[PDB]
Amino acid sequence: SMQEEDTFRELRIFLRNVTHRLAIDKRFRVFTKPVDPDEVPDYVTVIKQPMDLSSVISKIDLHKYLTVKDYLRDIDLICSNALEYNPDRDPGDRLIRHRACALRDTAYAIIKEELDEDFEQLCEEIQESR
Numbered sequence: 001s002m003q004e005e006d007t008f009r010e011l012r013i014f015l016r017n018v019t020h021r022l023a024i025d026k027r028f029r030v031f032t033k034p035v036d037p038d039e040v041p042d043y044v045t046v047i048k049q050p051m052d053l054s055s056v057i058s059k060i061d062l063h064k065y066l067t068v069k070d071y072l073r074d075i076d077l078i079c080s081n082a083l084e085y086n087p088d089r090d091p092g093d094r095l096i097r098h099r100a101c102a103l104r105d106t107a108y109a110i111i112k113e114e115l116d117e118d119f120e121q122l123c124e125e126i127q128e129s130r
C-alpha cells in the first residue's frame, strides 16, 4: 500500500541521516569509500563481502534495506571485515579495529536513542508479509 511505501521512505530517510552522521566523523574516514585495490591488492581476496559507508548509501537508495536490522547487518560487516583483515597487534591494525568498533557502537547508540521500537516492528511486519 501507499502507507507501507511511506513507512519504507521514512526508514530510508532515517538510515541516510544515521549514515551521514557516521560519514562526517573524522574517525571513520577510512570506512567512507571502498578499499582501493591498488594499495591493497589482497583485500578483495581476503574479504568476501567488502562494505563501506558509500556502499551503504547506495543500498539505501536502491531500497535494499527494509528494516533497521538489515542495515545493522551491513554496519556489523564494516566492523567484522576490519577485525578480520587487520588482526595484528601493531598500532596501525589496532587503530583500524578500534575505529571500526567505534563506528559500529556509534551506529547502535544512535539507533538505540532515536529509532522508535514500534517503527522497527512495523517495518519487520511489512517485510515478513512480502
Ligand SMILES: CC(=O)N[C@@H](CC(N)=O)C(=O)NCC#CBr
Pocket: 030, 035, 036, 039, 040, 081, 082, 085, 086, 096
Ligand atoms: C590497507 C590496510 O591494510 N588497511 C585498510 C583498512 C581496511 N581494513 O580496509 C585501510 O586503511 N584502507 C584501505 C587502504 C589503503 Br592505503
Ligand SMILES: [Cl-]
Pocket: none
Ligand atoms: Cl589517521
